[PDB]
Design a binder for this molecule. Structure first.
Ligand SMILES: CCCCCCCCCCCCCCCCCC(=O)OC[C@H](CO[C@@H]1O[C@H](CO[C@H]2O[C@H](CO)[C@H](O)[C@H](O)[C@H]2O)[C@H](O)[C@H](O)[C@H]1O)OC(=O)CCCCCCCCCCCCCCCCC
Ligand code: CLA
Ligand code: CLA
Ligand code: CLA
Ligand code: CLA
Ligand code: CLA
Ligand SMILES: C=Cc1c(C)c2cc3nc(c4c5[nH]c(cc6nc(cc1[nH]2)C(C)=C6CC)c(C)c5C(=O)[C@@H]4C(=O)OC)[C@@H](CCC(=O)OC/C=C(\C)CCC[C@H](C)CCC[C@H](C)CCCC(C)C)[C@@H]3C
Ligand SMILES: CCCCCCCCCCCCCCCC(=O)OC[C@H](COP(=O)(O)OC[C@@H](O)CO)OC(=O)CCCCCCCCCCCCCCC
Ligand SMILES: CCCCCCCCCCCCCCCC(=O)OC[C@H](COP(=O)(O)OC[C@@H](O)CO)OC(=O)CCCCCCCCCCCCCCC
Ligand SMILES: CC1=C(/C=C/C(C)=C/C=C/C(C)=C/C=C/C=C(C)/C=C/C=C(C)/C=C/C2=C(C)CCCC2(C)C)C(C)(C)CCC1
Ligand SMILES: CC1=C(/C=C/C(C)=C/C=C/C(C)=C/C=C/C=C(C)/C=C/C=C(C)/C=C/C2=C(C)CCCC2(C)C)C(C)(C)CCC1
Ligand SMILES: [Fe+2]
Lengths: 31, 27, 337, 75, 241, 19, 182, 34, 50, 31, 306, 38, 31
């Protein structure tokens, strides 16, 4: 069962990477 | 399960990527 | 007179001394200089004297000095014998009893260097605080030095304090530090520890950031108050190559600070853990699997075997106070598996 | 004062020329005459293994450490 | 002599040669005379290669380490000029078992290759002296001194890697008698000597030989990785399997 | 010879499309 | 130099013809660039510049079509005016996707002006326009020597001088023949 | 598996030809100014 | 061993040299080696990355 | 002149020269 | 309108994509994706690999009782050696797995991908009109990766000597490397360690100084730095400072990569064993001798003979 | 040929069409995977 | 290994559900 947990954690990290790459936040002013 | 696994993998990658390409081109 | 707050009061010798201390010379003494300079000078002098002349024959059984024929890579100031426990080894203490020659022979010079160096580090941090106040800047530089201070305290003070004695602290030398590194690997499995893993990442990422920032700022320069490089071009480049890129100078130059400090603090916490033999040595599940199944083998099992080899083969000489004698039939060997 | 003034000064050059080599030779003599071997307690090549003890020394004592170091060393 | 010449040309002499010596003076952006210089130096290299060939075939011979009963200097008389075998090495794979041009075995192949390269270099120099780059070449290159330097740097770095590998592995252009044994050679020598000493006292099979993945007999033990070794002292003892 | 055949096929295909 | 609103400052076409024949909004971006910041004002400046570039290209294409129509009606005059207008309002520092460094219509405009002056009696300006076309990267060299419109320019030796400067004979037949003879 | 080898060779050669022809298709660098 | 190590190191450094000088040569030929002109920068004429 | 600069420079230098001489002599010690 | 080739070429070299592709991305993207997919599948589930070629396989899959910290992609078998081992040369898929072919596949595709990644860095730098030297900086990690995965196996004559694509595998590689070669006592590894530590130091110090500078500057920070450690005329220009930042770690990593590559041909680090002896030629121990004892333990312990 | 096709159009699918397509592909895979694996 | 494949497919379907609920598409005109 541990393999499922490890794989899910890795996939979640990759999903966060994908979200950060593509669903980026538009810049604000001043920044 | 080598042929069973590859058939499942291709059935996911090939259509999903094709749909994504069309959506990108549309937008 | 000096104006303290709304009211103005008469001067005092303290004010004169403070005025002299903060005079703008080549060397900024400041109040902290009264503690940093003597301590640092004596730490450097002690290390140099110990490397050049003092020997380690009576404490470790080694020959660590230039006078005995050692390079710069082998000379060191070695820790006192394990029989000294955690004595501070004052030159006037009950061990040396004021005899300089036998104080040096007993290994007290290591304690001299370590204590004076710790107080020199305190003095340097205080100086970093002081100069920032004089120039009226936020003292972020001093807060960064907390990482090396924590590393020094964890490794040279907290660790041997939790062990049998000073004898297990790092000795001030190159080969001696390599010995310390191998000792932690063999006995503590330090590599597998989660907190070292989070310190290695810090240092390697810090080097990565240094290289990338140096290269980017130097390639997006403007041709020839105002910044000399184009933030827009760098952001575009590193967003179309990598995927994400900085867009705020403050955030970038604070991330560069944040990475190494956090990494070193994490490693220091890990070493504090090791100080009590509180090791992350093994995974029980794989140990059981290997024991019950002789044909099961991973890289972790091989690492465990290598650690066994290091311990068994080095303990004979690395720890003379135990008087260990290992016959050739009990030393671990690869062909015996 | 500025670096150039001291660099081109005459008093500085003469005093340093007459002083530095004396101190270099003083260090040379300190090493050669064997005084360094005594003040710091470093054994000379021959007296590493005394007749009484043919192995590396060992303290195994804390409060009586001075006397035991006296005995272990060849004095 | 070269030092005197260089010092003269550097200290006292025409800084720019184009004013008084149109033959030697040049401008990087120009393409005809840069190719002229390229052709001259190509001819020089071809002459050098042909000098090596002539030395090998005439006025003494090269040291062939594969001669029977220990190598000796031999005068090469039948160099292999066949195009197929010569270019087989160039098309040869670089991975284990093949090793690109590091697998040259007999000095005949070396001399034949040098014949081919000298001829090609002389022809290329002649061609370049009398020709200007075609439009596609002019459209796919940067024509300045630094660009030529960059191309030279890339080529020479690749050649450095090739020389490293050739020196490490090859043992025909680098006879073991002079450069010592190679790593694989040393391992195979150790295994072979152990086998010989064992069988001497005794007086695959013999607990020193095993079967390679393909299916032929090779030296056993940890030295099974070096079963591609081909040494002059050991070929006589090797059969089809 | 699979390499040679494949390369000849791919090059010919590209050239034929153009011509 | 073409002005913001027509004309010419040191119509542009009308003036150039005879000679040859003879902050408030974009402040936030500046302040952000002063520091090492990207921000949002830079984004609006980028969008404005991009839309302006697209509109400019559209306008240049339309007036190129207008000049072609004028040729169809046999009006060299307004067509040449349009051509040098197109040239006048070319982007200052344009890097194409294919590393072109010049807008693709720039080369054809240069060639069209060269052809216009080839028909017109005045020639040397045709040579200058052809040189500009060659430098801009008019890669195809065949109608340079085949077009009947350019025969008048080909009469002048400077035509062949420029062509040899850019299109040089690949092989020196004279040198090889001389070497063979000797 | 001959089919797999042929497929991989075809893909590799296609991509390499694409690379080479793409780098050929570019035009030489030049400075519009000066 | 000496020959292989030395010439591997030299080959690696000369490959680094190829990279450096080739990049510089192409940039200089293009004309923007000295830096960004600060007046009409190529990035400012691109659609924002959204 | 006996300002702080002089004191620091001499404190760092005098022992340095002493030690350099000591090590240079140490080189020739017969083994 | 425009030919299909024209549109497709324009798309590749288009700079409006979220991630630039370019002409180096055509080779980088498929290679990197192949390596990623094969690596993920092999890590999650792959049969044990006979690394040593003695019919004693090592299991490194996540499905064969390994953690994340223990799982790895075991390198090819010793029997294969340096031979090319594609899928189509193996007798059968199970045989291919049992000899660690996926490691070779991943290494080859990954190396191609990283080289093309360096090329792509240069090409986008050119497209944007900036000076093209980020690729030179990137060449350092690429050089180290090439040394670990390709040059060292070449020197040692087998692909089983490359670094396993795992964590505990990395530690095992490092320990065995120290056993065979004194990596610690080699000047190039010392240069690498100095480079990494100096990179961390310079990153922290530069970040702190710049952050404390921005208040709502450069002269004040320079004055503070000069008063701090007696360097008033050190890195006054911002450009010089940033070049130094770039250069230090890159030079360090270049030298450590070269050190590893040279050790691949058995040119080890310093060896001060029994260097100090008293009269009558009796050996006096030193720290180098204890390092030697540890190295001897590691060496003797992994020599698994059959 | 120089003349373009007068009857040349462009395909286009909105985001809703994407979601239906992705759901159909994944749901079919969920249903049929057990049988393919068998 | 099958349990890994089934779980990913089930999670993949759930992931699409999350996207469709929250990352909807703004209505067009006429529609
Ligand atoms: C392309 C990249 C290299 C792939 C090939 C790797 C390799 O296994 O290459 C090995 C080959 C040599 O192959 C060997 O060739 C040998 C030939 O020797 C044989 O033949 C000889 C004839 O005398 C001897 O008899 C010898 O005993 C006999 O075994 C053997 O066949 C070996 O089995 C075989 O492995 O090297 C060569 O041909 C030349 C290859 C040169 C490139 C290698 C270095 C690449 C470094 C890249 C990173 C640099 C840094 C980048 C910074 C950014
Ligand atoms: C590649 C190197 C090189 C090049 C390009 C030149 C080029 C030139 N030199 Mg320099 N020179 C060189 C090397 C070189 N020289 C060296 C090594 C020396 C030291 C001896 C000199 C000493 C020297 C002097 C003192 C003078 C020149 C002059 C000149 C100019 C006139 C040519 C000439 O000497 O007429 C001679 C040309 C001939 C064709 C006569 C016949 C020469 C035959 C072919 C000799 C061939 C030698 C052979 C190939 C050697 C191969 C050795 C190989 C194994 C390495 C010309 C610009 C003269 C000048 O104008 O000043 C700038 C001048 O006064 N040179
Ligand atoms: C600010 C500079 C500084 C600092 C922080 C230290 C700190 C230290 N030194 Mg170093 N040292 C210094 C300067 C300094 N030293 C100098 C200038 C010299 C050259 C002479 C030395 C020479 C030296 C040697 C040779 C040794 C040390 C040692 C030590 C340690 C033990 C301290 C101790 O017990 O001493 C005494 C500490 C105090 C007295 C603390 C002050 C407490 C107050 C003032 C007492 C007041 C009581 C009362 C009012 C006074 C009496 C009144 C009476 C007249 C009626 C400690 C780490 C020893 C050590 O640990 O080495 C391993 C050691 O062996 N130091
Ligand atoms: C006539 C045209 C011509 C010729 C023949 C050469 C020839 C040469 N040039 Mg070049 N050069 C030219 C024009 C020419 N150049 C022009 C126009 C320029 C621009 C100014 C240059 C600029 C230039 C530079 C900048 C350099 C050269 C160099 C060289 C020499 C390199 C030798 C070498 O390393 O070979 C390697 C291979 C061999 C040596 C093998 C060949 C063996 C010999 C030569 C052939 C055997 C027959 C021979 C004639 C017998 C020799 C007898 C002798 C022992 C007495 C070579 C002699 C390089 C040099 O160092 O010159 C000294 C150099 O750095 N040249
Ligand atoms: C160091 C020596 C040297 C140098 C610097 C050059 C340099 C040049 N030569 Mg010359 N050449 C040489 C030796 C040399 N040549 C020799 C010895 C010969 C005799 C065989 C020739 C015969 C020759 C001819 C017949 C022609 C050139 C041409 C050219 C130019 C075009 C670039 C090029 O060579 O194609 C490099 C290739 C490309 C830029 C395109 C890539 C195509 C593939 C990938 C590589 C070429 C195939 C390759 C050789 C076979 C192995 C393939 C493998 C890499 C996969 C360039 C100025 C051409 C030109 O215009 O000059 C007049 C030309 O037509 N050369
Ligand atoms: C024959 C090959 C060659 C040639 C002709 C040139 C020529 C030139 N280079 Mg290039 N370069 C080369 C190879 C070459 N380089 C290689 C292999 C590298 C990679 C390391 C570089 C990296 C490089 C850079 C980064 C720069 C140049 C620059 C220059 C120009 C000025 C030279 C200079 O800095 O002054 C003389 C150089 C020095 C005084 C520096 C010497 C210090 C070195 C590091 C000492 C090393 C000694 C050590 C024992 C070497 C062995 C190390 C061992 C580990 C292998 C000049 C046009 C500069 C320029 O302006 O470009 C236009 C510039 O910025 N080059
Ligand atoms: C081994 C690595 C290492 C070294 C040698 C080092 C050294 C230094 N860093 C300094 C600063 C800094 N380093 C920083 C962050 C970091 N520094 C790091 C790693 C290092 N930093 C890392 C990893 C980080 C990231 C968190 C910051 C943020 C700063 C500073 O602001 C400061 C500076 O000004 O930069 C220039 C300087 C402080 C001067 C000083 O101690 O005053 C004199 C004090 C003395 C002499 C007392 C210490 C005595 C020591 C502890 C006793 C031993 C002495 C012997 C000689 C030891 C020999 C050991 C043998 C093995 C050779 C000094 C040059
Ligand atoms: C073709 C090439 C493809 C490359 C694909 C990989 C790209 C990686 C993208 C990393 C995004 C990380 C999230 C950034 C989150 C984010 O949105 O940051 C955004 C941030 C920019 O922030 P701003 O400058 O807008 O900040 C403004 C301030 O007001 C603060 O918000 O970017 C960075 O600082 C760079 C940090 C890089 C950090 C790299 C970390 C890499 C970790 C990788 C771990 C992988 C584990 C895998 C396990 C199996
Ligand atoms: C060998 C080469 C490769 C071959 C394979 C290629 C495959 C290509 C993709 C084919 C599928 C495309 C699907 C388009 C999907 C799509 O977007 O359609 C959208 C379409 C309606 O779209 P409109 O015509 O309004 O859109 C107009 C334009 O904007 C274009 O969308 O609906 C249909 O025609 C039927 C769709 C399938 C039916 C959907 C509902 C039922 C299935 C879902 C059931 C879920 C489970 C429920 C029970 C648990
Ligand atoms: C312990 C003691 C003390 C004190 C002490 C001191 C204070 C000392 C000092 C000392 C010192 C202060 C020392 C110094 C030394 C120095 C040295 C030893 C140096 C060396 C150098 C070198 C070795 C160099 C090298 C080099 C260079 C840089 C140049 C060229 C290159 C080379 C790299 C070669 C007290 C009183 C507390 C108590 C009693 C005793
Ligand atoms: C002597 C010898 C031999 C042989 C030899 C030979 C045969 C040689 C050949 C050689 C060759 C046959 C070579 C070739 C080479 C090639 C190359 C080197 C290529 C390159 C390419 C490039 C560099 C490209 C580039 C580019 C492109 C891709 C396109 C456009 C852009 C550019 C320009 C970038 C033998 C073995 C018999 C024996 C031993 C020795
Ligand atoms: Fe910065």
């Amino acid at each position: 069962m541990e393999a499922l947990v490890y794989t899910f954690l890795l996939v979640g990290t990759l999903g966060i990477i994908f979200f950060s790459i593509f669903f980026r936040d538009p810049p604000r002013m001043i920044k | 399960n080598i042929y069973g696994l590859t058939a499942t993998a291709l059935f996911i990658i090939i259509p999903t990527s094709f749909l994504l390409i069309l959506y990108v081109k549309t937008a | 007179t000096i104006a303290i707050g709304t009211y103005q009061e008469k001067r005092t010798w303290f004010d004169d001394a403070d005025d002299w201390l903060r005079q703008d010379r080549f060397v900024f003494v400041g109040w902290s200089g009264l503690l940093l300079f003597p301590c640092a000078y004596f730490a450097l002098g002690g290390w140099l004297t110990g490397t050049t002349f003092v020997t380690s024959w009576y404490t470790h059984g080694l020959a660590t000095s230039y006078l005995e024929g050692c390079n710069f890579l082998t000379a060191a100031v070695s820790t006192p014998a394990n029989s000294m426990a955690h004595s501070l080894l004052f030159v006037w203490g009950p061990e040396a009893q004021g005899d300089f020659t036998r104080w040096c022979q007993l290994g007290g010079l290591w304690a001299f260097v370590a204590l004076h160096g710790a107080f020199g580090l305190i003095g340097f941090m205080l100086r970093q605080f002081e100069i920032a106040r004089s120039v009226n800047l936020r003292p972020y530089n001093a807060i960064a030095f907390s990482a090396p201070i924590a590393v020094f305290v964890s490794v040279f003070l907290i660790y041997p304090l939790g062990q049998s004695g000073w004898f297990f602290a790092p000795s001030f030398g190159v080969a001696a530090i390599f010995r310390f590194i191998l000792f932690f690997q063999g006995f503590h499995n330090w590599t597998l520890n989660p907190f070292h893993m989070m310190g290695v990442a810090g240092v390697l990422g810090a080097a990565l950031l240094c290289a990338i920032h140096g290269a980017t700022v130097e390639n997006t320069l403007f041709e020839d108050a105002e910044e000399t490089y184009s933030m827009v071009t760098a952001n575009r480049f590193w967003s179309q190559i990598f995927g994400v890129a900085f867009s705020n100078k403050r955030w970038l130059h604070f991330f560069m600070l944040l990475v190494p400090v956090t990494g070193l603090w994490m490693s220091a916490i890990g070493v504090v853990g090791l100080a009590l033999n509180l090791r992350a040595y093994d995974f029980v599940s794989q140990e059981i699997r290997a024991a019950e199944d002789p044909e099961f083998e991973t890289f972790y099992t091989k690492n465990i075997l290598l650690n066994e080899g290091i311990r068994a083969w080095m303990a004979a000489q690395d720890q003379p106070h135990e008087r260990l004698v290992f016959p050739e039939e009990v030393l671990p060997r690869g062909n015996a598996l | 004062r500025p670096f150039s003034d001291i660099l081109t000064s005459i008093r500085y050059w003469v005093i340093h020329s007459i002083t530095v080599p004396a101190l270099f030779i003083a260090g040379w003599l300190f090493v050669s005459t064997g005084l360094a071997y005594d003040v710091f307690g470093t054994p000379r090549p021959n007296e590493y293994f005394t007749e009484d003890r043919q192995e590396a020394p060992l303290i195994t004592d804390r409060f009586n450490a001075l006397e035991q170091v006296k005995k272990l060393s060849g004095n | 002599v070269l030092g005197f010449g260089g010092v003269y040309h550097s200290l006292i002499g025409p800084e720019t040669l184009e004013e008084s010596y149109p033959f030697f003076g040049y401008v990087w952006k120009d393409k005809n005379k840069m190719t002229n210089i390229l052709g001259y130096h190509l001819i020089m290299l071809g002459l050098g290669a042909w000098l090596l060939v002539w030395k090998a075939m005439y006025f003494g011979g090269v040291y062939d380490t594969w001669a029977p009963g220990g190598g000796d200097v031999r005068v090469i008389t039948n160099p292999t000029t066949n195009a197929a075998v010569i270019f087989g090495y160039l098309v040869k794979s670089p991975f284990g078992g093949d090793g690109w041009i590091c697998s040259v075995d007999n000095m005949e192949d070396i001399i034949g290759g040098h014949i081919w390269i000298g001829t090609l270099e002389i022809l290329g120099g002649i061609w370049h002296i009398y020709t200007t780059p075609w439009p596609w070449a002019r459209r796919a290159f940067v024509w300045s001194g630094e660009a030529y330097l960059s191309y030279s740097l890339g080529a020479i770095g690749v050649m450095g890697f090739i020389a490293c590998c050739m020196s490490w592995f090859n043992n025909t252009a680098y006879p073991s008698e002079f450069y010592g044994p190679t790593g694989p050679e040393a391992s195979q020598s150790q295994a072979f000597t152990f086998l010989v000493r064992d069988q001497r006292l005794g007086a695959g099979l013999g607990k020193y030989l095993m079967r390679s993945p393909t299916g032929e007999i090779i030296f056993g033990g940890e030295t099974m990785r070096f079963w591609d070794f081909r040494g002059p002292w050991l070929e006589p003892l090797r059969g089809p399997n | 010879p699979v390499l040679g055949w494949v390369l000849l096929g791919v090059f010919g295909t590209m050239w034929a499309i153009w011509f | 130099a073409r002005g913001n609103d027509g004309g010419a400052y040191i119509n542009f076409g009308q003036i150039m013809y005879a000679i040859r024949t003879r902050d408030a909004a974009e402040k936030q971006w500046k302040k952000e660039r002063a520091g090492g910041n990207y921000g949002a004002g830079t984004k609006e400046i980028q969008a404005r510049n991009y839309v302006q570039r697209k509109e400019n290209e559209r306008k240049r294409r339309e007036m190129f079509d207008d000049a072609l129509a004028k040729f169809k009606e046999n009006d060299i005059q307004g067509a040449l005016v349009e051509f040098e207008n197109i040239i006048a309002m070319e982007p200052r520092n344009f890097v194409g996707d294919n590393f072109s460094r010049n807008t693709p219509i720039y080369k054809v405009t240069q060639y069209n002006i060269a052809c216009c002056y080839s028909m017109l009696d005045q020639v040397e300006e045709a040579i200058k326009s052809l040189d500009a076309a060659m430098l801009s990267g008019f890669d195809n060299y065949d109608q340079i020597r085949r077009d009947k419109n350019l025969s008048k320019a080909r009469a002048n030796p400077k035509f062949q001088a420029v062509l040899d400067k850019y299109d040089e004979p690949v092989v020196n037949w004279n040198a090889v023949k001389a070497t063979f003879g000797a | 598996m001959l089919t797999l080898k042929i497929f991989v060779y075809t893909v590799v050669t296609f991509f390499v030809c694409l690379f080479i022809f793409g780098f050929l298709s570019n035009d030489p660098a030049r400075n519009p100014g000066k | 061993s000496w020959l292989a190590c030395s010439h591997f190191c030299l080959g690696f450094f000369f490959f680094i040299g190829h990279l450096w000088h080739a990049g510089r040569a192409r940039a200089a030929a293009a004309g923007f080696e000295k830096g960004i002109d600060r007046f009409d920068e190529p990035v400012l004429s691109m659609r924002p990355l959204d | 002149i006996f300002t702080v600069r002089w004191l620091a420079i001499h404190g760092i230098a005098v022992p340095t020269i002493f030690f350099l001489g000591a090590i240079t002599a140490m080189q020739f010690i017969q083994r | 309108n425009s030919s299909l080739w024209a549109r497709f070429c324009e798309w590749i070299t288009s700079t409006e994509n979220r991630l630039y592709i370019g002409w180096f991305g055509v080779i980088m993207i498929p290679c990197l994706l192949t390596a990623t997919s094969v690596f993920i599948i092999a890590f999650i589930a792959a049969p044990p690999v006979d690394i040593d070629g003695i019919r004693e396989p090592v299991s490194g899959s996540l499905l064969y009782g390994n953690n994340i910290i223990t799982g790895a992609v075991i390198p090819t078998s010793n029997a294969i050696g340096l031979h090319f081992y594609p899928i189509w040369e193996a007798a059968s898929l199970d045989e291919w797995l049992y000899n660690g072919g996926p490691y070779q596949l991943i290494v080859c595709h990954f190396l191609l991908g990283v080289y093309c990644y360096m090329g792509r860095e240069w090409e986008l730098s050119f497209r944007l009109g900036m000076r093209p030297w980020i690729a030179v900086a990137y060449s350092a990690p690429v050089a180290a990766a090439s040394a670990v995965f390709l040059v060292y196996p070449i020197g040692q004559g087998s692909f089983s000597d490359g670094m396993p694509l795992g964590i505990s595998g990395t530690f095992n590689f490092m320990i065995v490397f120290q056993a065979e070669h004194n990596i610690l006592m080699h000047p190039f590894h010392m240069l690498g360690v100095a480079g990494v530590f100096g990179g961390s130091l310079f990153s922290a110090m530069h970040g702190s100084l710049v952050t404390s500078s921005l208040i709502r500057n450069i002269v004040a920070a320079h004055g503070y730095f000069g008063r701090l450690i007696f360097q008033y005329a050190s890195f006054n220009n911002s450009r010089s400072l940033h070049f130094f930042l770039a250069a230090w770690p890159v030079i360090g990593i270049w030298f450590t990569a070269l050190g590893l590559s040279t050790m691949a041909f058995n040119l080890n680090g310093f060896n001060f064993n029994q260097s100090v002896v008293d009269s009558q030629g009796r050996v006096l121990n030193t720290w180098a001798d204890i390092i030697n004892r540890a190295n001897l333990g590691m060496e003797v312990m992994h020599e698994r003979n059959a | 040929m120089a003349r373009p096709n007068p009857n040349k159009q462009v395909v286009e699918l909105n985001r809703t069409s994407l979601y239906w397509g992705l759901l159909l592909i994944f749901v079919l895979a969920v249903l049929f995977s057990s049988y393919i694996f068998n």
